[PDB]
Amino acid sequence: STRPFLVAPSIANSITTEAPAINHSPELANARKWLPKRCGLITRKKGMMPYFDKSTGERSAATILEVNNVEVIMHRTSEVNGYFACQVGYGSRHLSKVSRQMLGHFASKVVNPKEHVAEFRVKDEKGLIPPGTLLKPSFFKEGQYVDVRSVSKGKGFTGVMKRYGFKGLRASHGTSIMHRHGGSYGQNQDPGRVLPGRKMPGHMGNEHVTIQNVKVLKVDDENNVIWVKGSVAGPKNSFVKIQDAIKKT
Amino acid sequence: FKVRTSVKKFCSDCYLVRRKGRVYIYCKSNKKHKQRQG
Amino acid sequence: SQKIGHSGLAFARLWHHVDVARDKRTLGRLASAIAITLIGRHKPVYHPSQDCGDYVVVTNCQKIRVTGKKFEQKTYWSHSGRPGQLKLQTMNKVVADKGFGEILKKAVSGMLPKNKLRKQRLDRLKVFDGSENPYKQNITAFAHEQSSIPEPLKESIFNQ
Amino acid sequence: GGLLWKIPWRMSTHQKTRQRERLRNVDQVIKQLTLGLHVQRCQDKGLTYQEAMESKKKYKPRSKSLRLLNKPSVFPKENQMSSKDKYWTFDKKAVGYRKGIHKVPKWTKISIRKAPKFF
Amino acid sequence: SQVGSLPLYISPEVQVSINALSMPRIIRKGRTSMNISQNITVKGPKGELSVEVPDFLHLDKDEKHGKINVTVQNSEDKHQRSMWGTVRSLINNHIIGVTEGHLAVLRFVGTGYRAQLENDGKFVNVKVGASIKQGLDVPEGIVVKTPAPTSLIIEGCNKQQVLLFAAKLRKFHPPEPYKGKGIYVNDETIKLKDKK
RNA sequence: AAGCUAAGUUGAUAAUAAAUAAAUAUUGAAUACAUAUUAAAUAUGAAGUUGUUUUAAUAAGAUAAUUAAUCUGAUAAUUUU
RNA sequence: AGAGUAGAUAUUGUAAGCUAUGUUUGCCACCUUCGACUCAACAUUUCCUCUUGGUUGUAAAAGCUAAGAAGGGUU
RNA sequence: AAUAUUUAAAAUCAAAUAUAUAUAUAUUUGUUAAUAGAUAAUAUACGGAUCUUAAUAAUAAGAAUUAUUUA
RNA sequence: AGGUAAAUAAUCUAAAGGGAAACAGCCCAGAUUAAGAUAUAAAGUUCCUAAUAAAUAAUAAGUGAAAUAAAUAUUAAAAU
Ligand SMILES: [Mg+2]
Ligand SMILES: [Mg+2]
Ligand SMILES: [Mg+2]
Ligand SMILES: [Mg+2]
Ligand SMILES: [Mg+2]
Ligand SMILES: [Mg+2]
Ligand SMILES: [Mg+2]
Ligand SMILES: [Mg+2]
Ligand SMILES: [Mg+2]
Ligand SMILES: [Mg+2]
Ligand SMILES: [Mg+2]
Ligand SMILES: [Mg+2]
Ligand SMILES: [Mg+2]
Ligand SMILES: [Mg+2]
Ligand SMILES: [Mg+2]
Ligand SMILES: [Mg+2]
Ligand SMILES: [Mg+2]
Ligand SMILES: [Mg+2]
Ligand SMILES: [Mg+2]
Ligand SMILES: [Mg+2]
Ligand SMILES: [Mg+2]
Ligand SMILES: [Zn+2]
C-alpha cells in the first residue's frame, strides 16, 4: 500500500534543533521598525489656500487634500506577508481604464474600480481596520500631526546649480563659456576616475517625498477635504498619502 | 592616567593589574601613580 | 576501452548530507572538505573541462566549530567601489545578520576554483542553521541502512 | 629598495630537510673517496677486492685535502654539525652576526660547515 | 589551593548539596577548556541560592563535626587550582548569607545628601545634588531599609549581589576629596586634602 | 494673468532600542594578602558602532484574470500631470 | 640632569640614546608651473562638539595635560 | 620560600665519534618564552580561502604557526 | 640611496623551462625534433593548485602562516 522510500541514517538520526533567529529575517525587521499604531488614507492634493485662525488672527498657507471613496480594500498580516499593513484604495475609475484582472480583484474585495491603491504599514494587528469600510476626513483630529508622502513636481533635466546649489563660475573677470558649470569633477590620476555619486547634471523631481510632522489645520466631512498646514509635494491632482506622525506622538 | 611604554610601580601602595591585554598600574595612596602600558 | 559503457551513473549528481552537530572538524577544514565534493574531485570520472560535482546539504550549522577568538575578532570585508565605503563586519555580526551557514558558504566560495563554474558549485551547497530543511528527502540512501533507523521516524520524515 | 627580491629571512621545513640531505651526500662522497683509496692501497699490497673491503685496519688518506676533510674539527659531518651551522652562515655585517644559508649565493652547490667558535 | 584546602563548617539547619545540570555548558578558552556540569546549592533559614560549577570539582561531605571539604581532580592543573579557591570561597559566602545574611551600610555625607524608599522598598530614590531625580530598582533577593534619611542599609543572601548594588548606589556620587562628601559603602575612607 | 522662482512659505538635524571604546565597578581565586577577569561568574559606560528615519534600486510574497463579441500590451490621434 | 614656593615624572624635560613618518630643505639621477575660482574625496597625528583618567600644582569657574572618538562642523 | 645575578656547553656535566682501549687522550654536540613598544591618507591584503579542537560519539577532525627530526 | 667608484664570482646582457604571488640580474636548470614509462633539481604536498603522513617540544598572541621593527617596559621560565 505504502510507496517505496529510503531515508538516510544521518538525516533520520539527526537530533532536532531549532535555528537561531537572524537580523535579516522579516519578523526581526518588523520588530525593529518605527511604525504608526493606526492606518492612513489616500488623498488628492486639490490645491492650496489661506487658513485664518479666528482667535489669534494668524494666517497660514494650507493645502486642501480631498478624500473621495477612500476604502480599505484588504490588509496584510505577519504570518502570510511578513508585516501588518492596510491596502487602501482611493476614488472611482471607469471599467474602460481598469484591467480585467484588476476588476476581478476589486470584485473579490467588494469595492468599486479604484483610482489609486496603496498600502499603509502599521505596528500591530490592532491597528488594522476592518476591510470594506469607508474612511472619511473625520478619521484625523484637528490639530493632530501627520506624515505626508507624495511624488514631487518634475523639474526635468536640471543643471548642478539648480540640483545641488553649486555656486558656478564668475559672471565677468575673464570667465569663458562655463558660467553655470560644476568646475572640477575629480582628481588627477590617484582616483583616475570620477568616483560614484559625484554631483552632476541630471533629471530632478518626480521622486517620492515624505514630509514629517505637518499639522492637520481643519477637517470637514461636508466638503470631503482635509486641510493641512503648509506645503505638500507634487502638482495639483497628485495622490498624497496621509498617516499619523511617528515622530510627533 | 600616564599612558606610556614603560610602566613601573612607584610607591609600595602601587599595584600592577593585567586587564584587556594591557598592563595597568593602579595605586591606593597616590592617584598620580596611575599608569597604563600603551 | 575503460571509458566505453553507460556513464549516466558516474556523472549523476548525488546529494551529500553533513550534520555539523556530529562533525568534529573546525570551520575551515570542513569548508575545504566540502569544496572537493562540490568540484567533483572525489569521483574518478572527473575532468577539469566538465563540471561534475555533487550537492552538499549542510545542517545544524549553528553548532559549527571555530577555534581561537575568531568568532569575535575575524572580520569579513566588503567594498562597492566608491571610496569611504569599506564595510568590515566581525564574524559574530555576520552570523547575527544571516547565520553560521553564510559564514560556511563564504569559506566554501574561497576554497572553490575561480572560473565560470564557481557560482554553480556554490549554489549546489545548501546550508541550514538548524535541523529542518527541504532536502531531507533527497539525501543518498540505501536499503541496507534501513534496519538501523527506527520504524516511525522514517514515516515522519517522509510526511515532512 | 624599490625592486622586490622577496626572499624570506628563514627557511621552510622542506628546505631544511633538503639542506640536511645535501650535507649528508657530501659526507658520503668523502667517505667513498677515502674507501676507494684504501681499497686501491690494499690491492697494491696484494689483496683481493673483497679481502680489502673486509680488512680491519682501514688506510687513512695521505693527500692533504682529503685528510682535512676526514677530520671533523675542520669538516664536520651532518650528524656531528650543530642545528645552527646547518641553517645559518656567519655574516659579520648582519645583526646577530648570522644570516640564513639560503641567502648565500649558490648555497645548494657551495659548502659551508664550520662557523667561528663564538659567532 | 591554600584557600580551597580550608574545610567548610556547616550547622544542621543548612544543607550543601550537589548535582549535575539539566544542560551542561562548556567554556572554551584558547587552548584549555572548562565544562560546567555540576550545580552546588546552599539552602538555609533566610533563603536558598546556587553555584554552577565545573566537573573536575567535587565535594566531600563528612557527618562528623559538621565539616565538608572541596577538591579537584588535578591540583597541578593551574586553571582547576584557580577555580578551587574561588568555588570554596563562594560557597562559604553563601553559607554566611543563608545563616546570618550579608549587609551593606551606605552613609550619605553632604548638605541635603540622603536616600529615600520611593516605591514601597522596590525603588531606592537617591538625592545627591542633581536637578533630575536619581535612583534604581532593588533586585530580587535584596531588601533595603533606611534607619535614617542619610544612612541607608542594603541586605541580602548573596554577598556578590548586595555589594554590587551598593557600588551602583555609590556611583551616583563617590566621596570627593576636598570635602568628605558623597556616598560611603561600609568601612570606606578617603584622605581629605588641605583646603587652602 | 499663468508659469518659474527666492527676498518668500512649510517641514526635517530620524527617536526608543542593542552591543561596545577609553574609563568606572561587584564577588573572587590562581598567589593565606591583593587583584573589575591577559581566570569562572556579575555590572555601568560615548556626537562613535549596530540600527532607526529618508530616497533609489530590486521583486520573495500576495490578490485577481486566464485564447479573449470590450484578455494584456504596442503602433496611431488629442495632450500634460 | 634640571625648573616647578617644598617633590625629577600636576605641568615642564638640556646635551647624549632608540624609533616612526615621507608633510619641509637636501642628496641620487631609474624617469625629460605658483596662486585664485569651481567642486571636492580621503586620512586622523582632534581645532570645536560627545565620553573619560591625572591635576601638594582639580574648592567653584576658567584652564593645563593625557585616553577613547572622524557622526556633524571647522570665516 | 626570600634576596641578587646570569640566560651560559668557554669552564662544568651529560651524550656521541676517533686513536691505545671495561680506562686515558683528542674531537664534536646540548643552555628561555610571551606581550607591549607598533604608527596616514582609493580598499581587508599571509597571493586568496582559511588555519589554534572537543568528552558524550562517530569504519572519520584535532595547526595549514614556531623549533628539532623521521619516512 | 634602485647612489657613486672600482676588486672577485655568477647570472642577465644574448637564455627559453621549474620555483620565488606577479619578477632581465635571486634559488634550480641550458629548448636539435618528438614521445611521456623511470629517476629527479630548486621549490612544494588542507582547498584554490600537481603532491603527506608521523614524532617530540613550545606558542594562544591569529604571534605567525615566502618581504623578521629598535632601545626600553611588564609578565612568566630555567640555572646559579
Ligand atoms: Mg553666480
Ligand atoms: Mg560670455
Ligand atoms: Mg580575595
Ligand atoms: Mg577586590
Ligand atoms: Mg548613543
Ligand atoms: Mg630640583
Ligand atoms: Mg635632546
Ligand atoms: Mg618622496
Ligand atoms: Mg586618535
Ligand atoms: Mg573645573
Ligand atoms: Mg550614529
Ligand atoms: Mg665543549
Ligand atoms: Mg591596508
Ligand atoms: Mg602563500
Ligand atoms: Mg646603479
Ligand atoms: Mg645590447
Ligand atoms: Mg630566464
Ligand atoms: Mg651564458
Ligand atoms: Mg643545448
Ligand atoms: Mg597575522
Ligand atoms: Mg609578510
Ligand atoms: Zn603609588
From Swiss-Prot, chain A:
Pfam families membership: Ribosomal_L3
Intrachain disulfide bonds: none
GO CC annotation, single: mitochondrial large ribosomal subunit
Main subcellular localisation: mitochondrion
PROSITE patterns: RIBOSOMAL_L3
MF terms in GO: structural constituent of ribosome
Swiss-Prot/TrEMBL GO biological process terms: mitochondrial translation
Keyword match Transit peptide: yes
The organism's place on the tree of life at top rank: Eukaryota
Alphabetical list of SUPFAM superfamilies matching this protein: Translation proteins
Locations listed in the record: Mitochondrion
Keywords: Mitochondrion, Ribonucleoprotein, Ribosomal protein, Transit peptide
General function of this protein: Component of the mitochondrial ribosome (mitoribosome), a dedicated translation machinery responsible for the synthesis of mitochondrial genome-encoded proteins, including at least some of the essential transmembrane subunits of the mitochondrial respiratory chain. The mitoribosomes are attached to the mitochondrial inner membrane and translation products are cotranslationally integrated into the membrane.
Subunit organization: Component of the mitochondrial large ribosomal subunit (mt-LSU). Mature yeast 74S mitochondrial ribosomes consist of a small (37S) and a large (54S) subunit. The 37S small subunit contains a 15S ribosomal RNA (15S mt-rRNA) and 34 different proteins. The 54S large subunit contains a 21S rRNA (21S mt-rRNA) and 46 different proteins.
Similarity section: Belongs to the universal ribosomal protein uL3 family.
Leftover remarks: Present with 3200 molecules/cell in log phase SD medium.
Name listed for the protein in its UniProt record: Large ribosomal subunit protein uL3m
The organism of origin for this protein: Saccharomyces cerevisiae (strain ATCC 204508 / S288c)
Organism taxonomic ancestry: Eukaryota, Fungi, Dikarya, Ascomycota, Saccharomycotina
UniProtKB/Swiss-Prot annotation, chain B:
Subcellular location(s) per record: Mitochondrion
More info: Present with 500 molecules/cell in log phase SD medium.
Similarity comment: Belongs to the bacterial ribosomal protein bL36 family.
Quaternary structure note: Component of the mitochondrial large ribosomal subunit (mt-LSU). Mature yeast 74S mitochondrial ribosomes consist of a small (37S) and a large (54S) subunit. The 37S small subunit contains a 15S ribosomal RNA (15S mt-rRNA) and 34 different proteins. The 54S large subunit contains a 21S rRNA (21S mt-rRNA) and 46 different proteins. bL36m has a zinc binding site.
Protein task: Component of the mitochondrial ribosome (mitoribosome), a dedicated translation machinery responsible for the synthesis of mitochondrial genome-encoded proteins, including at least some of the essential transmembrane subunits of the mitochondrial respiratory chain. The mitoribosomes are attached to the mitochondrial inner membrane and translation products are cotranslationally integrated into the membrane. bL36m may be involved in a process influencing telomere capping.
Protein name, UniProt field: Large ribosomal subunit protein bL36m
Gene name in the database record: RTC6
From Swiss-Prot, chain C:
Domain of life: Eukaryota
Gene3D superfamilies to which the protein is assigned, alphabetical: Ribosomal protein L13
Pfam families xrefs: Ribosomal_L13
Modified residues (N-acetylserine): 1
Main location: mitochondrion
Coiled-coil ranges per UniProt: none
Alphabetically ordered keywords of this record: Acetylation, Mitochondrion, Ribonucleoprotein, Ribosomal protein
Propeptide residues according to the Swiss-Prot or TrEMBL record: 1-3
A GO BP entry: mitochondrial translation
InterPro entries, sorted: Ribosomal_uL13, Ribosomal_uL13_bac-type, Ribosomal_uL13_CS, Ribosomal_uL13_sf
GO molecular function: mRNA binding; structural constituent of ribosome
Regions that span the bilayer: none
Gene Ontology CC terms: mitochondrial inner membrane; mitochondrial large ribosomal subunit; mitochondrion; ribosome
Location in or out of the cell: Mitochondrion
Record note on quaternary structure: Component of the mitochondrial large ribosomal subunit (mt-LSU). Mature yeast 74S mitochondrial ribosomes consist of a small (37S) and a large (54S) subunit. The 37S small subunit contains a 15S ribosomal RNA (15S mt-rRNA) and 34 different proteins. The 54S large subunit contains a 21S rRNA (21S mt-rRNA) and 46 different proteins.
Entry similarity comment: Belongs to the universal ribosomal protein uL13 family.
More details: Present with 6700 molecules/cell in log phase SD medium.
Function, as annotated: Component of the mitochondrial ribosome (mitoribosome), a dedicated translation machinery responsible for the synthesis of mitochondrial genome-encoded proteins, including at least some of the essential transmembrane subunits of the mitochondrial respiratory chain. The mitoribosomes are attached to the mitochondrial inner membrane and translation products are cotranslationally integrated into the membrane.
UniProtKB/Swiss-Prot annotation, chain D:
Identification of the protein by name: Large ribosomal subunit protein mL60
Chief place of localization: mitochondrion
Localisation per UniProt entry: Mitochondrion
Organism of this sequence: Saccharomyces cerevisiae (strain ATCC 204508 / S288c)
Subunit and interaction comment: Component of the mitochondrial large ribosomal subunit (mt-LSU). Mature yeast 74S mitochondrial ribosomes consist of a small (37S) and a large (54S) subunit. The 37S small subunit contains a 15S ribosomal RNA (15S mt-rRNA) and 34 different proteins. The 54S large subunit contains a 21S rRNA (21S mt-rRNA) and 46 different proteins.
The family this protein is said to belong to: Belongs to the mitochondrion-specific ribosomal protein mL60 family.
Keywords for the protein's UniProt record, in alphabetical order: Mitochondrion, Ribonucleoprotein, Ribosomal protein, Transit peptide
Further information: Present with 2100 molecules/cell in log phase SD medium.
GO terms (BP aspect): mitochondrial translation
GO molecular function, one term: structural constituent of ribosome
Function: Component of the mitochondrial ribosome (mitoribosome), a dedicated translation machinery responsible for the synthesis of mitochondrial genome-encoded proteins, including at least some of the essential transmembrane subunits of the mitochondrial respiratory chain. The mitoribosomes are attached to the mitochondrial inner membrane and translation products are cotranslationally integrated into the membrane.
One cellular component term from this protein's GO annotations in UniProt: mitochondrial inner membrane
Presence of the UniProt keyword Zinc in the record: no
Signal peptide: none
